[PDB]
Amino acid sequence: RSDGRKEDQLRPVSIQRDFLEYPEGSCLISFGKTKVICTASVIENVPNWLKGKGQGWITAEYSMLPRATQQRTIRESVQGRIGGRTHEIQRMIGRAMRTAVELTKIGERTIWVDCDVIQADGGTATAAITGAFVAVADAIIKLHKEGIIEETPIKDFVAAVSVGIVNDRILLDLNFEEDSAAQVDMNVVGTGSGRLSEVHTMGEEYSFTKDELIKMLDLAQKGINELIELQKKLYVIQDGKWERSELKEVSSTT
Amino acid sequence: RSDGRKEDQLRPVSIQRDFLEYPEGSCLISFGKTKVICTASVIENVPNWLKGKGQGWITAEYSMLPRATQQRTIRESVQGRIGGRTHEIQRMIGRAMRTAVELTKIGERTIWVDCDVIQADGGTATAAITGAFVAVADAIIKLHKEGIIEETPIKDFVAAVSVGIVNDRILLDLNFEEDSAAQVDMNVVGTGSGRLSEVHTMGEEYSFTKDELIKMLDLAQKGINELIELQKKLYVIQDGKWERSELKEVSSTT
Amino acid sequence: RSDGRKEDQLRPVSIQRDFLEYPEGSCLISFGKTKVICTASVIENVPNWLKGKGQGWITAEYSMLPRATQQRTIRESVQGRIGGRTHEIQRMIGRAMRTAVELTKIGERTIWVDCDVIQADGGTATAAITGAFVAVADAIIKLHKEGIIEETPIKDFVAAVSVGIVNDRILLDLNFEEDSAAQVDMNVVGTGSGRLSEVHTMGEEYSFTKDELIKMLDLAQKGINELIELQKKLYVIQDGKWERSELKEVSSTT
Amino acid sequence: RSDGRKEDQLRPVSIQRDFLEYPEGSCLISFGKTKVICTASVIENVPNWLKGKGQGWITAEYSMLPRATQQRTIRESVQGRIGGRTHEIQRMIGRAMRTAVELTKIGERTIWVDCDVIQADGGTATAAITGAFVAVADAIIKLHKEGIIEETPIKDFVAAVSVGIVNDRILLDLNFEEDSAAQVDMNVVGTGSGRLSEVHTMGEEYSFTKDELIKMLDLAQKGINELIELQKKLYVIQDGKWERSELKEVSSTT
Amino acid sequence: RSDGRKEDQLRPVSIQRDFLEYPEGSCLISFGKTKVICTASVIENVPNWLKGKGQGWITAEYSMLPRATQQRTIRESVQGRIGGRTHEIQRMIGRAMRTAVELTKIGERTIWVDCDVIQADGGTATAAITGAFVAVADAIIKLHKEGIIEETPIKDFVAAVSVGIVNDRILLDLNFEEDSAAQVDMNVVGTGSGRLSEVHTMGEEYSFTKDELIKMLDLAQKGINELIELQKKLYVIQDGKWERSELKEVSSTT
Amino acid sequence: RSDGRKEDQLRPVSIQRDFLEYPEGSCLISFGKTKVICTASVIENVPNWLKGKGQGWITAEYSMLPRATQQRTIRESVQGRIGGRTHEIQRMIGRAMRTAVELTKIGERTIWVDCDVIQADGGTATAAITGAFVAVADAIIKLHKEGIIEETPIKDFVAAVSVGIVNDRILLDLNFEEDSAAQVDMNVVGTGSGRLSEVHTMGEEYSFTKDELIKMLDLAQKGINELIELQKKLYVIQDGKWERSELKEVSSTT
């Protein structure tokens, strides 16, 4: 592969917590040149349709700063029309975070997750999900430490990674060139206990077999596991009680 | 199940070609109460980025008439903001159609696919993909018969179906109630030769296992096969040459 | 005339009730190649400005599926700006339905009328009004049969037709070619008892005389009457009590 | 009537030409408290679809300054959604101006008509059409005087007025209260030679008869004639050559 | 200078109160060819965030009718995207009016200020502020005379003017040509007692010195004073009680 | 002051160049808790109105990530309406950068400046201008080193700072609390040689004197000078030739 990386090998991964001061939780995550700021802010309110249902909510906003993929990704501000792509990913990030949290125990508040891609080189959505978790966990731990909530109702770790078939090779965690040249690309969102939260496989004018899907899913689950091993070094958990470890940054040895 | 249907059983399916006169291809497809009008219109032009590249294009527009799911699905007209959901599905339908067609041989024109859901009861997106194919195939056959193009460059049939886990039961082709009550729902897009074009599995605040994904994918591929057997009765193909059969409508015996 | 039709002759008309299952009322109407799906759905609420005024409301949404007039009528979704034309017609349809109904007796609910043009060849707005009535009447009858309301407060039938001056000939019910070539075109909305609800005459860079307006209005009222004779076969009315006849479809003998 | 005005009587009318300096043509017209600034500006270009067709174009923009009808008519700027009503009227004004001008002889340029309602008390659209004509005529005369065009290709005067049925009385030129209380209201656009350009009659939850329409149309044509007699004092015409008279303002004696 | 005007000389200024009848306050102001209609309307309500805070509010809407600067300034209606420029000026006008009024004493109502530029030749924003004051003062006086409020809580006069450096000359009140050719342009908003409310100086690809800023500010304050001397002739004030003088129009002797 | 800072004292300032890899120039700047990512990307094209005029262009995009001022600043994406405030600042940043660059010598390309506020505590716009310069200078130096352009046509350093009057005290560089409580706030944009590019002073319902403006401007120019002394350590310049120093980060000793 271009970067001299193996086929079943992730790019250098780095996760830095406490990136910013104001959010209850925040981090700067990077998969290679792909960099995303993930923040988690508590809003002392809930969406109208949940009012009074004794439950919290998590929702997410994703944005790709104009300078992405070394090209131009002009925001949704000084422009107009909005892409259902940004929306597709925001919904993805939202589903991943809610699956990992027992919202029953968050109280009637909302964790507003913001994922700001400050540099894109493929895998930006899976990088955002991986980072968003750390920011959400930190934010729940912060809320607990402040006494706003009784426990730290986090069910499990959540991470995500991309995989694809390029020139008939199954590659793990694709950068932008590999993805634009892929016959089949795929995003996988997994949990700490080895389960799955989401899987989206797409043939790019090429079809694939059930077996190729499984091969890809197998490689992705291994990628997810390595990412979760990194995330794990950031926490100290016991019987459902979460505390942050003393690490402020964790990175892959690659 | 509510409708007395089995777990590995599709709802009554009906596909009617030549539903409208003006489009090069058109049909009314129905999966139960879910009904979608699928039309395919040729536009003698191409997207700027393809100009001169000796190739055709296929793109799709999906809309859900206000009266859907027995509720209100107010269009994107007399309103304002647009959902990335409509966009997510339009992109899905577009990918499915392009995968099934050798665009090299369509010439520099575009097949504009319109999917109009006139009644929603779950599975509307997979129903639209299933119907869109018939309209695209008919339209290519029509273009051939008119002498606009040399052959009928259709690679294979394409159909799609939903599957999910509801109250820990794996169900095929979900209606709206089963889907809103599902722990995991999934859309699968497959081909004539038994391959896959797309798979999207989503945990709805529940995670799942690789094996459950495979069980679901297995049930879906069987569903896809039954839908493609129906579609097949509408065509007579030999060595890549496509002609319409004499059927104007095909329906499942259920 | 192109289609071999006489000057004071309507195109073949067809009205099919119960086209869809979910709406309280629904039909597929066609004036030649012009086809419109008209549905009427009850929303158990009212516009804020009517709250508590012991009255119901009727409002309408009109849309022209991209494939219309054998050309491209891209919706208001994956685009942006909205035309005051769609709005002009929605307001027209709304005025026609409210005139035909004693809203005092509908209770505080709204009949949401949806007119979806699935094929356009001129006269689409008058076709929608003609069809919308049948869907609204059926919906009121349905509400009565369900016991939601005491009576069937329908004042009279409502239908509409276009007329114009083309190459100095006064033609009834124009298709798309006649209308684009017309010096003066006009839409007329009339009632069962031979009265008028709306009339809009427009010189297309040509002016006309009071007498020509009357000639046109006379031809239109005859057209309206024929359309209302068709609609009438769909109902059995006595002393203001409306019941559906046993016909599911009615068509002109032409 | 409220203002002590007769049923077949217009409000005090005033037309002032040369209201502004920059536009080729401009005026401030008033029907009672209804006041509209009408300007006509030449743009040395044409809409793409007319390029090279040896013809000019006229199009119009209508706006209702927030302070209208003594209430709030917040513009389309610091808001968002646009009403098809503004559009309906802009199209009306456009049709009226083009009918009155032989566009063949204007050259490939466009007369951009701007109608700015600075005070609304009913009849604002008909007032705008009445005023827009004067601004368009002046602008064509100005273009001629500057040598940009050979002649003054104006076919005839154009004016417009409203009429309605209120408490079963047929009233001419309605103010805002009469119009909101009307059973049937109507806008009529007529020419110098007594012909018609447009007529739009609308039952407001009340239907009407062919004869009532004629009575109303008769009253309107008389109103149109009085307005055109005023406009006429502003010009000196002979064999199709138009020159401005020496009047800068003309008003009705009422 | 082009118009034969001196460097420290304003263009001919004219202010006409009672321009329209419906607004509580209104005027037509002109700085040369720059003309702006300024109206002030009372809305018996307040912005949600002020509800119950025993205070009034003033906000402003600015619009530039398509015919401005002898060019085309197409509104925000039949277009789409909005400029932050219109917003920048609306905020400016809002700040100027609120500074001049003791909102504590207006009650819980809002003065809606509308500034409609009907002709642009530079200095349109400062002209609007100058005119908006007169309309706001008149409106407060009107509210007092109607007994809606106890006193006339107007703190002081407010006026504004532009100044710039053109070909290294410091000019007062620039028309459109001088401003587009300026190296540095500036808007100043001042009060009756010689104080300042706002100052915005902008280098147009040229930088300037603190001293040049002061020279410009000095010239502007003299301009502001002359404009306020004009405004003053429109009122008769004593111990904070404001009454209108008998002048309906005031103009500079130039 | 709250933070124990003096009245004529800036918050701790930090500027880090090469923050990201893809942009030709980039940095993370911080004034206290106020943090902004500033990137400069070259687009090998120019705005249509400049085509062929042998000149380059600089334009800017500013955005405030939802998590700002410890509150919610929801972007312009999944929302709709846009604020003229974002636009006001983008125009400010654009004017500052163009003033500092001899665009004649950049060739026909555009430097696209992106300012992404990742944490807001007042002074975010002046912080963005201060940071944007460093990114633009680096980008021009980068373009030179790559041989795309002959020289490094940078005229001078540009920096900006806020100042205000709070409880009658003139404070330098205000955080969010001081600014919301200020009677008069002001933004100043200055150059390396001690000149000014922009000054915007705004009374917040309070007026001020020419002398207070000068006092504030004096304090700001001292602030600008300190910021420019920091920026200066990042470059080594001689006779108009710019090279980066070896520092990657520079911070104030405070």
- CA dist A21 and A14 (Å) reads 19
CB contact under 8 A, D199 and C196: no
| CA distances to B92, D49, D230, E230 from D157, in Å | 57, 28, 11, 43
CB contact under 8 A, E87 and D78: yes
- CA dist D164 and F104 (Å) reads 66
Query: Tokens 């339209």 — which residue?
Result: B139
- CA dist F217 and E212 (Å) reads 13
Rounded to 5°, the CA angle A48-A49-A53 comes to 105
Query: Tokens 């505080």 — which residue?
Result: C108
CB contact under 8 A, E39 and D65: yes
Compare all CA atoms of chain C with the CA of B41 and give the residue at the minimum distance.
Answer: C67
Q: What is the dihedral of CA C86, C92, C94, C100, to 10 degrees?
A: -160
Q: Nearest CA of chain C to the CA of B85: how many Å?
A: 11
Residue F209 touches partner E, C-beta closer than 8 Å = yes
Closest CA to D110 of D157, D167, D199, D50: D50
Helix (H), strand (E) at residue A127:
helix A124-145
* Type of residue at B130: T
Inter-chain Cβ pairs, chain D and chain E, closer than 8 A: 95
Q: Cβ atoms within 10 A of the Cβ of C94, count?
A: 19
Query: Given the DSSP bridges, would you call strands E196-203 and E184-191 parallel, antiparallel or unpaired?
Result: antiparallel
In a domain, F1, yes or no: no
* Type of residue at F85: R
Nearest to D33 among E21, E66, E119 (CB): E21
* Type of residue at E179: D
- CA dist F38 and F58 (Å) reads 14
- CA dist F78 and F75 (Å) reads 7
- Would you call F38 helix, strand, or coil by DSSP? strand
In a domain, B3, yes or no: no
Helix (H), strand (E) at residue A29:
strand A25-31
In a domain, B63, yes or no: yes
Helix (H), strand (E) at residue F214:
helix F210-232
Residue D44 touches partner E, C-beta closer than 8 Å = no
- Would you call D151 helix, strand, or coil by DSSP? coil
- The answer to whether F106 touches F46, Cβ cutoff 8 Å, is no
Long-range contacts of residues E244-253, Cβ cutoff 8 Å, at least 24 apart:
E244/E17, E244/E138, E244/E141, E247/E17, E248/E16, E248/E17, E248/E18, E249/E14, E249/E15, E249/E16, E249/E17, E250/E14, E250/E15, E251/E12, E251/E13, E251/E14, E251/E15, E252/E10, E252/E12, E252/E13, E252/E14, E252/E226
Chain E residues within 8 A of F90 when measuring between CB atoms: 84
- The answer to whether E45 touches E55, Cβ cutoff 8 Å, is no
Query: Given the DSSP bridges, would you call strands C235-238 and C241-244 parallel, antiparallel or unpaired?
Result: antiparallel
In a domain, E4, yes or no: no
Task: List % helix, strand, coil for chain F (3-state, nearest 5).
Answer: 30, 35, 35
In a domain, C4, yes or no: no
Q: Chains B, C in contact: 3+ Cβ pairs under 8 A?
A: yes
Q: Which two tokens stand for residue F231?
A: 């920026």
Closest CA to F123 of F61, F185, F34: F34
Chain F residues within 8 A of A63 when measuring between CB atoms: 63, 65, 75, 77
- The answer to whether F169 touches F9, Cβ cutoff 8 Å, is no
Which of B118, B124, B177 to probe the C interface (max C CBs under 10 A)? B118
- CA dist F62 and F113 (Å) reads 8
Q: Chains D, A in contact: 3+ Cβ pairs under 8 A?
A: no
Q: Cβ atoms within 10 A of the Cβ of E21, count?
A: 11
- CA dist B218 and B197 (Å) reads 15
Residue B67 touches partner C, C-beta closer than 8 Å = yes
Q: Which two tokens stand for residue A108?
A: 């009637």
- CA dist F67 and A116 (Å) reads 11
- The answer to whether C36 touches C118, Cβ cutoff 8 Å, is yes
Domain count, chain C: 1
Inter-chain Cβ pairs, chain B and chain C, closer than 8 A: 95
- Would you call A99 helix, strand, or coil by DSSP? helix
| CA distances to A35, A244, A247 from A23, in Å | 18, 16, 18
CB contact under 8 A, C78 and B72: no
Helix (H), strand (E) at residue A135:
helix A124-145
Q: Which two tokens stand for residue B230?
A: 């129906």
Q: Give residues 71 to 100 of F whose Cβ lies within 8 Å of E.
A: 81-88, 90-91, 95, 98-99
Nearest to F210 among E82, E83, E221 (CB): E221
Q: Cβ atoms within 10 A of the Cβ of C87, count?
A: 20
- CA dist B90 and C228 (Å) reads 40
- The answer to whether D119 touches D34, Cβ cutoff 8 Å, is yes
The length of chain D, given as a count of residues = 254
D130 Cα distance to chain centroid: 3
Query: Tokens 């909101």 — which residue?
Result: D180
Chain C residues within 8 A of D218 when measuring between CB atoms: 210
Which of D78, D113, D146 to probe the E interface (max E CBs under 10 A)? D78
- CA dist F184 and E97 (Å) reads 16
CB contact under 8 A, E112 and D66: yes
- Would you call A1 helix, strand, or coil by DSSP? coil
Helix (H), strand (E) at residue B16:
strand B13-17
- The answer to whether E102 touches E155, Cβ cutoff 8 Å, is yes
Query: Given the DSSP bridges, would you call strands E57-64 and E110-119 parallel, antiparallel or unpaired?
Result: parallel
Closest CA to F216 of F201, F227, F205: F201
Angle between helix axes A210-232 and A124-145 (nearest 10 degrees) is 40
Compare all CA atoms of chain F with the CA of A90 and give the residue at the minimum distance.
Answer: F78
Angle between helix axes C124-145 and C210-232 (nearest 10 degrees) is 40
- CA dist D213 and C188 (Å) reads 12
Chain D residues within 8 A of C81 when measuring between CB atoms: 82
Q: Chains B, E in contact: 3+ Cβ pairs under 8 A?
A: no
Chain E residues within 8 A of F206 when measuring between CB atoms: 99
* Type of residue at C201: T
Rounded to 5°, the CA angle A198-A202-A203 comes to 155
End-to-end C-alpha distance for chain B, whole angstroms = 15
Structural domain range at position B87: 12-254
Chain A residues within 8 A of F22 when measuring between CB atoms: 33, 67, 70, 119
- CA dist E178 and A235 (Å) reads 65
- Would you call D202 helix, strand, or coil by DSSP? strand
Nearest to B119 among C20, C72, C118 (CB): C20
Q: Which two tokens stand for residue F92?
A: 């400010």
In a domain, C233, yes or no: yes
**HEC assignment per residue over chain E:** CCCCCCCCCCCCEEEEECCCCCCCEEEEEEECCEEEEEEEEEECCCCHHHCCCCCCEEEEEEEECCEECCEECCCCCCCCCCCHHHHHHHHHHHHHHHHHECHHHCCCCEEEEEEEEEECCCCHHHHHHHHHHHHHHHHHHHHHHCCCCCCCCECCCEEEEEEEEECCEEEECCCHHHHHCCCEEEEEEEECCCCEEEEEEEECCCCECHHHHHHHHHHHHHHHHHHHHHHHCCEEEECCEEEECCCCEEECCC
Chain E residues within 8 A of D39 when measuring between CB atoms: 65, 67
Helix (H), strand (E) at residue B71:
strand B71-72
- The answer to whether A197 touches B184, Cβ cutoff 8 Å, is no
Nearest to A95 among B87, B202, B221 (CB): B202
**Bridge partners for F98 per DSSP:** none
B51: left (phi over 0), alpha (psi -120 to 50) or beta: beta
Q: Chains E, F in contact: 3+ Cβ pairs under 8 A?
A: yes
| CA distances to B122, E182, F221, F224 from E7, in Å | 74, 14, 29, 32
- CA dist E197 and E190 (Å) reads 5
CB contact under 8 A, C90 and D82: no
CB contact under 8 A, F76 and A77: yes
Q: Cβ atoms within 10 A of the Cβ of D181, count?
A: 13
Residue D37 touches partner E, C-beta closer than 8 Å = yes
Q: Nearest CA of chain F to the CA of E85: how many Å?
A: 6
In a domain, C73, yes or no: yes
Q: Cβ atoms within 10 A of the Cβ of D105, count?
A: 16
Closest CA to D55 of D93, D96, D110: D110
| CA distances to A32, F1, F9, F120 from F4, in Å | 41, 5, 10, 19
- Which residues is chain B interrupted after (C–N above 2.5 Å)? none
CB contact under 8 A, D67 and E39: yes
Chain F residues within 8 A of A90 when measuring between CB atoms: 78
Query: Tokens 């600043």 — which residue?
Result: F73
- Would you call D119 helix, strand, or coil by DSSP? strand
* Type of residue at C96: A
Residue B236 touches partner C, C-beta closer than 8 Å = no
- Would you call B178 helix, strand, or coil by DSSP? helix
Which of B197, B216, B224 to probe the A interface (max A CBs under 10 A)? B197
Exposure string of C48-67, with b = 16+ CB inside 10 Å and e = fewer, is eeeeeeebbbbbbbbbbbbb
CB contact under 8 A, A196 and B214: no
In a domain, E177, yes or no: yes
**Bridge partners for E250 per DSSP:** E15
Chain F residues within 8 A of A21 when measuring between CB atoms: 33, 119
Residue C204 touches partner D, C-beta closer than 8 Å = yes
- Would you call A33 helix, strand, or coil by DSSP? coil
Indicate the DSSP class of residue D100. Answer: H
Q: Cβ atoms within 10 A of the Cβ of A83, count?
A: 15
CB contact under 8 A, F82 and A78: yes
Q: Which residues contact B8 (CB under 8 A, 6 or more apart)?
A: B172, B219, B222
| CA distances to E27, E137, E139, E194, E232 from E243, in Å | 16, 9, 11, 22, 11
Q: Which two tokens stand for residue B168?
A: 């820990």
Q: Which residues contact C65 (CB under 8 A, 6 or more apart)?
A: B37, B39, B63, B114, B116, C73, C75, C116, C117, C118
Chain A residues within 8 A of F116 when measuring between CB atoms: 65, 116, 118
Compare all CA atoms of chain A with the CA of F27 and give the residue at the minimum distance.
Answer: A118
Residue A240 touches partner B, C-beta closer than 8 Å = no
Sort E167 into a burial class: Cβ within 10 Å, 0-12 / 13-18 / 19+: exposed
CB contact under 8 A, D61 and E74: yes
| CA distances to A123, A167, A172, D60, F207 from A177, in Å | 11, 12, 13, 50, 58
- CA dist F34 and B253 (Å) reads 67
The DSSP annotation for chain C comes to -TTS--TT----EEEEE--SSSSSEEEEEEETTEEEEEEEEEES---GGGTTSS--EEEEEEEE-SEETTEE---SSSS----HHHHHHHHHHHHHHHHHB-GGGS-S-EEEEEEEEEE-SS-HHHHHHHHHHHHHHHHHHHHHHTTSSSS--B---EEEEEEEEETTEEEES--HHHHHT-SEEEEEEEETTS-EEEEEEEESS--B-HHHHHHHHHHHHHHHHHHHHHHHTTEEEETTEEEE-S-SEEE---
- The answer to whether B138 touches B26, Cβ cutoff 8 Å, is yes
Residue D200 touches partner C, C-beta closer than 8 Å = yes
- CA dist D98 and D100 (Å) reads 5
Residue C183 touches partner B, C-beta closer than 8 Å = no
- The answer to whether C133 touches C96, Cβ cutoff 8 Å, is yes
CB contact under 8 A, B86 and C77: yes
Chain F residues within 8 A of A67 when measuring between CB atoms: 20, 22-23, 39, 41, 112, 114
**Bridge partners for B171 per DSSP:** B164
* Type of residue at C4: G
Query: Given the DSSP bridges, would you call strands A110-119 and A57-64 parallel, antiparallel or unpaired?
Result: parallel
Q: Cβ atoms within 10 A of the Cβ of A6, count?
A: 10
Chain D residues within 8 A of E23 when measuring between CB atoms: 67
Q: Cβ atoms within 10 A of the Cβ of A197, count?
A: 30
Closest CA to B128 of B232, B35, B253: B35
| CA distances to C76, C203, D46, D103, D107 from D55, in Å | 31, 19, 9, 6, 5
Q: In CATH, what number is assigned to the domain containing residue B38?
A: 3.30.230.70
CB contact under 8 A, F112 and A78: no
